[PDB]
Amino acid sequence: DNPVLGTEVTFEKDENGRIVKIISKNQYRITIYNSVDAGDTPNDASVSLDVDFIDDKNSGEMGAVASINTFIPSGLRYVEGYKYKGVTNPIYKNLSAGMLWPKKYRVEVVNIPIDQATKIITATPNNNIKEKQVSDTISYGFGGSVSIEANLAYTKTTTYDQPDYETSQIKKTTKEAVWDTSFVETRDGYTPNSWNPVYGNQMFMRGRYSNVSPIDNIKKGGEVSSLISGGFSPKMGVVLASPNGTKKSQFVVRVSRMSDMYIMRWSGTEWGGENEINQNVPKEYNALMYEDVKFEIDWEQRTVRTI
Amino acid sequence: DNPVLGTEVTFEKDENGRIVKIISKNQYRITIYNSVDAGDTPNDASVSLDVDFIDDKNSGEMGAVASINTFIPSGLRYVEGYKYKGVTNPIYKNLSAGMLWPKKYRVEVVNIPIDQATKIITATPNNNIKEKQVSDTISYGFGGSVSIEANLAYTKTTTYDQPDYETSQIKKTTKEAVWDTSFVETRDGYTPNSWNPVYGNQMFMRGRYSNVSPIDNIKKGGEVSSLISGGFSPKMGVVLASPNGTKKSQFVVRVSRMSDMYIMRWSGTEWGGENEINQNVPKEYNALMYEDVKFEIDWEQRTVRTI
Amino acid sequence: DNPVLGTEVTFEKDENGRIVKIISKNQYRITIYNSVDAGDTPNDASVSLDVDFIDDKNSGEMGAVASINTFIPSGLRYVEGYKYKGVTNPIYKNLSAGMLWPKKYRVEVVNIPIDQATKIITATPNNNIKEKQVSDTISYGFGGSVSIEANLAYTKTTTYDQPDYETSQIKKTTKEAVWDTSFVETRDGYTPNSWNPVYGNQMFMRGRYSNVSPIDNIKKGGEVSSLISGGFSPKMGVVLASPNGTKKSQFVVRVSRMSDMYIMRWSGTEWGGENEINQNVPKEYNALMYEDVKFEIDWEQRTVRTI
Amino acid sequence: DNPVLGTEVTFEKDENGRIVKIISKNQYRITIYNSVDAGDTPNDASVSLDVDFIDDKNSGEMGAVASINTFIPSGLRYVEGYKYKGVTNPIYKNLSAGMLWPKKYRVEVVNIPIDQATKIITATPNNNIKEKQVSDTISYGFGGSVSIEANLAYTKTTTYDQPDYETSQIKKTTKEAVWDTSFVETRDGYTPNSWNPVYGNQMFMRGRYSNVSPIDNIKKGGEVSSLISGGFSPKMGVVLASPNGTKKSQFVVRVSRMSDMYIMRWSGTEWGGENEINQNVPKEYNALMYEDVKFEIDWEQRTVRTI
Amino acid sequence: DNPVLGTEVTFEKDENGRIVKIISKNQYRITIYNSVDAGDTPNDASVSLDVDFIDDKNSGEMGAVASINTFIPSGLRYVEGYKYKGVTNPIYKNLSAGMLWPKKYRVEVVNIPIDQATKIITATPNNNIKEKQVSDTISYGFGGSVSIEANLAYTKTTTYDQPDYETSQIKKTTKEAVWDTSFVETRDGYTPNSWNPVYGNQMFMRGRYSNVSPIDNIKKGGEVSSLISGGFSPKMGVVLASPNGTKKSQFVVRVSRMSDMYIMRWSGTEWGGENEINQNVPKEYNALMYEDVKFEIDWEQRTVRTI
Amino acid sequence: DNPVLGTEVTFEKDENGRIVKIISKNQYRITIYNSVDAGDTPNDASVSLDVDFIDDKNSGEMGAVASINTFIPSGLRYVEGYKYKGVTNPIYKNLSAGMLWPKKYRVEVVNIPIDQATKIITATPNNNIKEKQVSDTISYGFGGSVSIEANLAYTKTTTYDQPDYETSQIKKTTKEAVWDTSFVETRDGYTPNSWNPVYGNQMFMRGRYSNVSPIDNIKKGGEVSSLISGGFSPKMGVVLASPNGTKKSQFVVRVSRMSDMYIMRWSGTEWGGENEINQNVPKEYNALMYEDVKFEIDWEQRTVRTI
């Protein structure tokens, strides 16, 4: 609720003349002072900060609602002949192919006070208690035949919504907020730790027996999560409260993408998949991107500038 | 919220007379300046840009919300006798027919600064964590007969919404936003990578054993996706933030469609289908459309003009 | 409802001149004075207090709606070789691994009067009577054969929503409110009190027979509750009513988490899970966090300051 | 609907001067005068009364809408070695354990007229006709075999919502209103009156054959009702109508909880549960809590003060 | 819709002075004059009448919307040893127990004209045509065996909502409106007219073979309808239209409560339930409550007073 | 939409004095002039007419929206010993009992012009095209055995809403509108024309073999339709249009109920039900109730008066 409160009326007059202009100004309790900026990164991960400063006369401290819109590209890379045998990586042989895919996204927003003790009040993406629907059923039954048959059955149905990527706020202090976004499972039900005795890992095994190129047997496009074919677009909101005399603050948004290597090999008879975790991928493929965009927030000028 | 804020009252007076006109003007925080233009392409792919400039007194930089309404025609082309044997292409023999269809659409919007560092803040079509519904049921059971029968069943039901085309935002920087929209699978559940060892690919087989013309046996009209019979109509939105003294900017919307060739052959006994990918289609059919519409955004005049 | 009520108009006049300014002020019954502060803790558990003081002309006692936004980190800790045999804790052997996870969250808010008898009126998170859906079916049946078969079945289906964590308000007085948030069960249906005679506790058994590291066999990320991988974010609201002459009050938000140790051991043939309760975990791992954030609420200055 | 009705404008003038202030006051039909107080009890059962006096010019009697928010703690107590044999209660033996739990909550609100005949008009928590869904299915069936099969089946599905606790308004007069809230059944379907020939009462029997402490075999936390692990928080509303000349009234909110003792005993082979009703529990455990909070309602001063 | 219509502005002036006060009054078409009163009865059945007089300038007759909020206690009475054999009534023997329960509620509102022909226009609780959902399925089927099996099934499913109590308006004239609310059935499907050849009527038979006291075998609390454990709370509305010169009217709300006696007897082996109807219950138990609350509605002073 | 249009300002002045009162009147396009009356009948069937005259300056004719609220009592009558044999009706023998119940309700509203051609424009209760839900399912099936199983099944599900009483507007002219409300079937599915070879008609046959009085074997209360236990309360609306010079009109609401006699006889072994249609019921029981209430509508005075 933002009532009109009062009105102040002033008069601009002519030289030794009557009133030639009437200026009315309505005084509102809440004033929205909006600024917005954006910044790219070497690996094309964009961060845009939109800060609305809340000039509130009925407040003891300055406040700012900041919306962070981030795009972290998935970096879905395809490499020919990746580890067909051992650690050998020839581009000639095409019996195996590797796909670098972003297993878990990381987002850090850091508040760096400069002149006054600016504090992070709340972060909009918060962990919620996810609930399931449980249906427990008892059934009895008797028969006549003509001997007598008795049946007793238990059933328990558990229904829940399973997202492809789970976003969890792993840290939230007055100076920094850190969110994780972990891959849970595919729409088929396969997980990064899944393993078949003969078929390996089948997260993105397009065909069980396909006479196609190893990349052509890797799911891509609409068959995978939109955060794997495209990128991660987390909408975030941080409420900053700072003393009344604040001049400048710093806001560092750190984006980190850790990618694993889905290896699609062709054995003598059957296809196979192996998930090589981030810490095992060779450094030549840059499986861990850790980049940052820095903004300066001028509370007096009420501006956001990519510094 | 856009309150009235203040009012300014001026008086137009007659020659040595009283007040003959009173002009009141309410001063609003938000002013919307709407402009819209459109542009065609050689293959009739239209791009319309509707930019609302947000004149904000409570802002440190100019902003513009631009809605892109695009029509990229499917280019659904029918070719007689397409590759009945090898790479031979007679128009005479009608035992086979080719259908050029748009597997993947690609739309790029490019921000080209001229006078000031105009930046792309947010692109409305964003990748979302699409979730499925999982129901797990465990059922026990006992019997009486009259010996004793025991039953145990595990059930896992996964329910999800699968669109015909999946739109994924593959790039988003301060200067360029790229969306891709790829074909996922047909209404019945065939995919471009599907293969029947005796029937081939059945994405668009109207009849399994049909004594009709090869084109007459290819699904068309309402039996295929509206993006195949008609065209792609992506609604897009980009928020541009530029310094206060900005004069002129450029906005290039690039439309790209990659079309594959559904080859529908008639064998000795059965019908057959083969999906020839975009890079294998001969250049004479123009399987890859890559064209652009350029707009000039006058931030001072608050206009959009197709250049 | 907050109507305009009346208006007071005053005139600012020049020195021996006419009215050069008209100041109108609308007198509202309800006035909101918003203050907000935040405070961290040694183990990065943040507490933010947002107090809206309700200046009510139609009230005999001052009121304040205080929203507490808390982040209590899960403290999900991984320890190598945790109690492979007895109480021996080598970091060398990796046949077992312990995971410290927060079973029970505890949040206390304490109202400490200083000058006047400030009282807690209500606390927004309240215990609610959760209802289940019961469906009872009685089925008869007759047969013809050709002797005569008779069937009679009774079925009772119970459906309810089961949250991963149950939040219960265990105490609510005029001076302090205490909430618990206890782990109920995982999505798969295992509880800390569950026990398989051959497999132990399987709350976080990623694989029954997996040739992986013990940590890799412990469920983490999106496979567990967001309050286990990330942290607890309880949104809370307390209504404080105090006499008209109140100057200062104190508000102590106490956050406590009790963490248990899920032990994943590797036996000769099968994995095994054992949940060591909080009171049995050695003190070296800090299984019980109990920390506080103190705020001073100035009812005259209408501010909240972390003290 | 609360229209503005009229407005009264008065002028504050200077000493032998023009109008220096204009005071406008809008006269509304409905005026809300809000007061709120709270009071604790020796067993920490808080009662908060929030009375909104309705100054209505179009009325012949004063009215007050009072919202009562009470917290009655469950008093969930655990006692070692409760009645292992006979009435012997040693703390040494831990083959049995008793749980004092709140079967039934009782809330009385008493209106005590002092100066005028203050009357209770209505009480918001009212008994509602609970409806179920009945589905009657009649099915015929014939068979062909090749003799002739005849089948006839009747099914009756009864679906309803069963709360854990049922709140019933057992009394409502002009001077006092009494609500009861009795335990109906557990989420599993067990009731205080349930009895197995060998397994006893299984309302809170966590494990059927568990080698754990008797308390560890008693359901607690999220496995029980929130009114058992935490407390009862009933939101209540009473409309009071009193003559125009009323000065002071009294409002006594009486909170009562009756607790049973769920006894978990360990027999030679199996666990056992016994529900000892309130009148049988020894007085040393205080199975019946009966407290009251008194408020004085000043209709002239329009205040509520805990007396 | 209640528009502002016109405004009347009057000026209160000082003695030989300028205007010292301006009184504006908006004249609305519809004015609501609210009065409310309440009255108890010897058997603690409260009736509260809240009459809103609608002063309508655009009307030829006075109108009043009266809301009746009633509480008729269930009178759930337990009698020891009620008619174990014949009509003998010992309090000593406890092989049987009687429960007086409110089968049927009756509510009369009587309009008694005094000065003018006051009439009842509409009564809010009206009989509605309740609809059921009927699904008819016809199923054919053929078999292959390898002789040929043919199946034909007809199924009819009828789904409807069955309340525990059905409220029917049996009378509605210009001077008297009578509603009846009769018991239909319990949640388990038992009716007062139900009868088992050996088990009797099982409306409130808690245990089929239970070694408990007869009262302990009678369903009570949340296991029965809220109108049986608690009381009936009918919300009612009557529209009264009377000539313009009406001064006083009378409104008699008559509450009637018909109770039956449910008998739980203990035979040699099995329990037994018998419902003794209202007209057979001895007069000493007061099975038919018939009480009234009289109100005087002063249309001139626009008040309601219990007379 | 009813905009304020203009405002009309006049001044009441004192004798040789300044302006003492300012009269403002806002001129609205739509003016609602409300009148309401009601009338009873010898058999207590009440009819209430609530006419809102629409004084619309932007209209060429007077209009009136009339809401008719009628209560037609069911007349559910119980007669002892009705037609046990032949046409003999002794009150002594109680082997049979008859119940007079309202099968079909009739409502006529008649427009009788007096001075001008008053016309009925529309009647709110109108016949709607009732739609059902049809589900057609084909199922194929093949088996492996190990001979070969072939299955083919048709299913057709028809789902619809069946109310107890069907209301139909059987006539609608400019001078009279006639609605019918006929009984369709009970919740059990029995029809007035339903007939069993041995059990007769079972619409209200409470017990198949019940050793009770014949009335006690007849369904009553909540087991029957609310229009049978209580009465019919149809909400109706008629739009009347009249010339600008219309002075007085007449509105006659005729209410008619046709009652049948459900006879419950006790044969040697089984109960039996017979539905005696309205034209066969003896005239002594008044099976056809047909009354009328007349109202005079004064368009100048804009009043409704029962004549």
Side-chain angles (χ1 to χ4, degrees), chain E residues 5-9 58 61 121 126-127 130 132 134-140 142-145 161 174 193, chain F residues 21-22 24 26 34-36 40 48 148-150 152 154 156-158 160 162 186-187 206 223 226 231 233:
Chain E
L5 275 190
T7 61
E8 282 175 51
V9 168
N58 304 352
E61 64 273 6
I121 292 304
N126 278 342
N127 319 313
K130 54 212 184 272
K132 65 182 181 180
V134 186
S135 67
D136 294 331
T137 62
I138 297 89
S139 71
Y140 293 99
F142 308 105
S145 301
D161 293 16
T174 50
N193 320 135
Chain F
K21 196 178 204 203
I22 299 183
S24 162
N26 295 17
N34 189 1
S35 181
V36 65
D40 291 331
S48 51
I148 52 170
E149 181 66 26
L152 166 61
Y154 292 166
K156 174 151 147 163
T157 297
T158 289
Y160 54 85
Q162 184 69 264
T186 81
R187 282 198 167 181
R206 183 177 292 171
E223 325 179 343
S226 296
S233 179

Side-chain angles (χ1 to χ4, degrees), chain F residues 160-176:
Chain F
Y160 54 85
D161 267 6
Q162 184 69 264
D164 291 331
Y165 272 78
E166 211 55 50
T167 187
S168 65
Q169 174 169 286
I170 62 170
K171 185 176 180 180
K172 187 269 183 181
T173 78
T174 53
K175 299 195 173 71
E176 65 183 1

Side-chain angles (χ1 to χ4, degrees), chain A residues 28-258:
Chain A
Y28 293 85
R29 177 207 158 197
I30 298 295
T31 301
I32 315 292
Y33 283 131
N34 171 258
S35 181
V36 64
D37 214 334
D40 291 331
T41 52
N43 296 115
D44 310 308
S46 179
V47 171
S48 51
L49 188 54
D50 189 358
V51 173
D52 307 306
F53 305 89
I54 306 299
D55 194 13
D56 178 52
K57 295 180 176 67
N58 306 350
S59 184
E61 63 273 5
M62 326 189 90
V65 170
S67 292
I68 302 94
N69 280 294
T70 311
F71 184 77
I72 313 162
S74 62
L76 191 66
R77 186 176 172 87
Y78 283 106
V79 54
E80 294 293 328
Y82 181 84
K83 293 182 183 293
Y84 177 53
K85 298 290 180 67
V87 299
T88 313
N89 273 348
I91 61 169
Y92 187 37
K93 65 179 73 174
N94 297 333
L95 297 176
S96 70
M99 150 176 78
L100 205 52
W101 68 285
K103 158 177 260 184
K104 182 174 72 68
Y105 286 96
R106 179 73 74 61
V107 189
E108 290 103 349
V109 289
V110 187
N111 186 8
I112 302 177
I114 294 195
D115 291 331
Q116 295 276 353
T118 313
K119 285 150 170 313
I120 285 188
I121 290 305
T122 187
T124 55
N126 283 316
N127 322 312
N128 309 113
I129 318 185
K130 270 161 206 71
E131 69 275 16
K132 53 191 174 63
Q133 181 175 181
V134 188
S135 177
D136 303 334
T137 292
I138 192 66
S139 75
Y140 319 129
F142 309 105
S145 300
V146 169
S147 179
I148 52 170
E149 175 208 31
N151 305 343
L152 170 62
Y154 292 166
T155 64
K156 176 152 147 154
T157 294
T158 288
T159 299
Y160 54 105
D161 293 29
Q162 185 68 262
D164 291 331
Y165 270 84
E166 185 50 70
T167 303
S168 65
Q169 174 170 286
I170 62 170
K171 185 176 180 180
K172 187 269 183 182
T173 79
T174 53
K175 296 196 172 71
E176 85 166 31
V178 188
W179 296 269
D180 274 23
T181 303
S182 295
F183 186 76
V184 165
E185 49 163 5
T186 61
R187 293 169 148 258
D188 189 305
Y190 293 120
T191 195
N193 296 115
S194 167
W195 183 260
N196 193 284
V198 65
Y199 276 131
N201 195 301
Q202 325 180 21
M203 293 182 286
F204 308 100
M205 182 179 72
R206 183 177 292 171
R208 183 177 292 171
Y209 294 104
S210 295
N211 195 31
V212 298
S213 301
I215 296 170
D216 281 303
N217 205 7
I218 294 187
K219 294 181 176 67
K220 65 179 72 66
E223 324 176 356
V224 305
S225 189
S226 295
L227 312 188
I228 302 165
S229 71
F232 190 38
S233 181
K235 272 81 68 178
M236 294 182 286
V238 57
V239 165
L240 291 158
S242 179
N244 269 325
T246 308
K247 285 165 100 52
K248 272 190 193 202
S249 191
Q250 281 189 358
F251 201 81
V252 186
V253 179
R254 296 200 260 240
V255 294
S256 179
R257 182 180 63 83
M258 293 182 286

Side-chain angles (χ1 to χ4, degrees), chain A residues 7 61 127 132 136 144 174 193, chain C residues 36 40 150 158 160 185 206 231:
Chain A
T7 61
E61 63 273 5
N127 322 312
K132 53 191 174 63
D136 303 334
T174 53
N193 296 115
Chain C
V36 65
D40 290 333
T158 288
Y160 46 86
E185 48 173 28
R206 183 177 292 171

Side-chain angles (χ1 to χ4, degrees), chain E residues 77 82 89 281-287:
Chain E
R77 184 176 176 87
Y82 184 93
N89 217 28
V281 175
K283 292 177 70 68
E284 65 183 1
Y285 293 100
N286 295 285

